[PDB]
C-alpha cells in the first residue's frame, strides 16, 4: 500500500512528462466510449453520439484536463492521498452516487492511455507504481470509512 522510493520515482518521472490536456482528454473519452454507461453522468457535455464525436468534444477535453490535474495533486503528495480527495469523495460518492467500480475502470483506462503514449518507457515496474497510485485515488474517492 505504502509507496516505495522506486514507485515514488516512477510516478514523479512519468508525471513530469505528462501533458494533462492530451492525456486527460484521451482518458475521459475512452472511459465514455469503452464503458458507455458512464455517459449517464455527463449529459451536459452535449454530443456523445459516437467515438469521433466524443473524441472531438471540447467539454470532454476540458473536463479530462481537470481530472488529470487532480491526479497531479496526488502526485505532489503521495502520502496525503486520502485527505487530498476527501471533498471529491463527497462529490463522487455521497452526491453523485458514482459506483466505485467506475473509479477502477477510469484507473485502468488511464494506465492504457499512459502505455500508448509512453511506449516501452512504461515498463512493468513503472505500471506497477502507477497502478498503486490510481488504485489509491480510487479508494480515496469511494465511500469514506472511519
Amino acid at each position: 500500500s505504502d509507496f516505495t522510493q522506486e514507485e515514488r520515482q516512477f510516478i514523479v518521472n512519468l508525471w513530469g512528462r505528462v501533458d494533462v490536456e492530451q492525456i486527460g482528454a484521451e482518458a475521459l473519452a475512452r472511459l465514455l466510449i469503452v464503458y458507455p454507461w458512464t455517459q449517464r453522468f455527463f449529459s451536459s457535455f452535449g454530443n456523445l453520439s459516437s467515438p469521433s464525436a466524443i473524441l472531438h468534444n471540447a467539454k470532454v477535453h476540458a473536463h479530462g484536463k481537470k481530472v488529470l490535474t487532480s491526479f497531479g495533486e496526488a502526485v505532489k503528495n503521495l502520502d496525503q492521498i486520502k485527505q487530498t480527495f476527501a471533498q471529491l469523495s463527497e462529490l463522487h460518492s455521497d452526491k453523485l452516487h458514482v459506483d466505485p467500480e467506475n473509479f477502477k475502470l477510469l484507473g485502468n483506462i488511464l494506465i492504457i492511455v499512459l502505455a500508448a503514449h509512453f511506449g516501452k518507457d512504461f515498463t512493468p515496474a513503472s505500471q506497477a507504481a502507477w497502478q498503486k497510485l490510481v488504485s489509491a485515488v480510487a479508494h480515496a474517492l469511494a465511500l469514506r470509512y472511519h
Binding site: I54, N108, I111, I112, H117, K120, P124, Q127, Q131
Partner: protein, 141 residues
C-alpha cells in the same frame, strides 16, 4: 455479443500479434505478476524472473490459445472448451484474475501498437477478452 465489426477489429489485432506471440505473451504475464503480485501464487513452480524460460513458454501458450479463439471467433467456446474445466474445476482460478490478465494484454498492445489500439479497437478487443474469459469461467457451477 461480438458484432461483425468487432470480429474484424480482433482479427486486425491478431495480425499485429502474429509474429510476436511469445514476446507479447511473456510481457503480458510479466505485467500481470509485477502489477498484481497476488497473481504469482498461481505459479509456485515457475521461475518468475524477468524473462525466464518458463514465463516465455507459458506466455506463448496463453497467447496462442487466444489466437485459437480469434480463428474460431464464431464459436470461441468449442475452441477453448479444453481449457474451461482445467481453469475453473481443477485449478479453481478466482475469476477476478481473468480481468487482470485481459487488462495486462491490453497494456502490452498499447505499448507496442498505440495507433492500432484506437478506442473502437479497444472496445472490440475488450468485448473479445471478456467473451474469451467467460468461456474459461463458465464451468465453475
Amino acid at each position: 455479443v461480438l458484432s461483425p465489426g468487432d470480429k474484424a477489429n480482433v482479427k486486425t489485432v491478431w495480425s499485429k500479434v502474429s509474429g510476436h506471440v511469445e514476446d507479447y505473451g511473456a510481457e503480458t504475464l510479466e505485467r500481470l505478476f509485477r502489477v498484481y503480485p497476488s497473481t504469482k501464487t498461481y505459479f509456485p513452480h515457475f521461475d518468475l524472473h524477468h524473462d525466464s524460460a518458463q514465463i516465455r513458454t507459458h506466455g506463448k501458450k496463453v497467447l496462442t490459445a487466444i489466437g485459437e479463439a480469434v480463428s474460431h471467433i464464431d464459436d470461441i467456446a468449442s475452441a477453448l472448451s479444453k481449457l474451461s474445466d482445467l481453469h475453473a474445476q481443477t485449478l479453481r482460478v478466482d475469476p477476478v484474475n481473468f480481468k487482470l490478465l485481459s487488462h495486462s494484454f491490453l497494456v502490452v498492445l498499447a505499448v507496442h501498437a498505440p495507433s492500432l489500439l484506437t478506442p473502437e479497437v479497444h472496445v472490440s478487443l475488450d468485448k473479445f477478452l471478456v467473451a474469451v474469459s467467460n468461456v474459461l469461467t463458465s464451468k465453475y457451477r
